[PDB]
Amino acid sequence: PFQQFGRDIADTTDAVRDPQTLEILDITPCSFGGVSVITPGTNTSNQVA
Amino acid sequence: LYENQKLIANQFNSAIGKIQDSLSSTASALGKLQDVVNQNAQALNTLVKQ
Ligand SMILES: *[C@@H]1O[C@H](CO)[C@@H](O)[C@H](O)[C@H]1NC(C)=O
Ligand SMILES: *[C@@H]1O[C@H](CO)[C@@H](O)[C@H](O)[C@H]1NC(C)=O
């Protein structure tokens, strides 16, 4: 019922509450992954995956 | 061996049963794997908290 702020282990906000209304909100960084260029050598080809 | 083959087979089967029973008793037998995973997990956990 107190402040509109929340925290986690990594000190990055996860759950908050709106200022104007009183609805609870969950914050989560959107789709994040990692590219991994699967490639042969430059001279044999340039197409990658 | 060729005179005591049945006895050797019985002892081998009994030993396999005993080692299976020992493996079905506690996880402390696998005290090495439960460390190779728990050390990396703890390292990642303490890296997160930094
Ligand atoms: C602020 O917005 C909330 C949600 O729409 C509303 O309930 C509240 O009455 C508003 N406050 C005002 C207009 O002072
Ligand atoms: C690049 O050329 C050499 C010939 O000089 C060839 O042996 C090699 O396979 C080529 N690179 C790749 C990734 O195939």
From Swiss-Prot, chain A:
Function: Attaches the virion to the cell membrane by interacting with host receptor, initiating the infection. The major receptor is host ACE2. When S2/S2' has been cleaved, binding to the receptor triggers direct fusion at the cell membrane. When S2/S2' has not been cleaved, binding to the receptor results in internalization of the virus by endocytosis using host TFRC and GRM2 and leading to fusion of the virion membrane with the host endosomal membrane. Alternatively, may use NRP1/NRP2 and integrin as entry receptors.
Domain of life: Viruses
Gene, per the UniProt record: S
Full-protein residues shown: 561 to 609 of 1273
Name this polypeptide is given: Spike protein S1
Positions glycosylated per UniProt: 43
Self-association and partners: Binds to host ACE2. RBD also interacts with the N-linked glycan on 'Asn-90' of ACE2. Cleavage of S generates a polybasic C-terminal sequence on S1 that binds to host Neuropilin-1 (NRP1) and Neuropilin-2 (NRP2) receptors. Interacts with host integrin alpha-5/beta-1 (ITGA5:ITGB1) and with ACE2 in complex with integrin alpha-5/beta-1 (ITGA5:ITGB1). May interact via cytoplasmic c-terminus with M protein. May interact (via N-terminus) with host bilirubin and biliverdin, thereby preventing antibody binding to the SARS-CoV-2 spike NTD via an allosteric mechanism.
Organism, scientific name: Severe acute respiratory syndrome coronavirus 2 (2019-nCoV)
UniProtKB/Swiss-Prot annotation, chain B:
Function: Subunit of the fusion protein that is processed upon entry into the host cell. Mediates fusion of the virion and cellular membranes by functioning as a class I viral fusion protein. Contains a viral fusion peptide that is unmasked after S2 cleavage. This cleavage can occur at the cell membrane by host TMPRSS2 or during endocytosis by host CSTL. In either case, this triggers an extensive and irreversible conformational change that leads to fusion of the viral envelope with the cellular cytoplasmic membrane, releasing viral genomic RNA into the host cell cytoplasm.
Region (Heptad repeat 1): 5-50
Effect of residue 35 to N: In strain: Delta/B.1.617.2, Mu/B.1.621
Protein name stated in the entry: Spike protein S2'
Species classification: Viruses, Riboviria, Orthornavirae, Pisuviricota, Pisoniviricetes
Organism of this sequence: Severe acute respiratory syndrome coronavirus 2 (2019-nCoV)
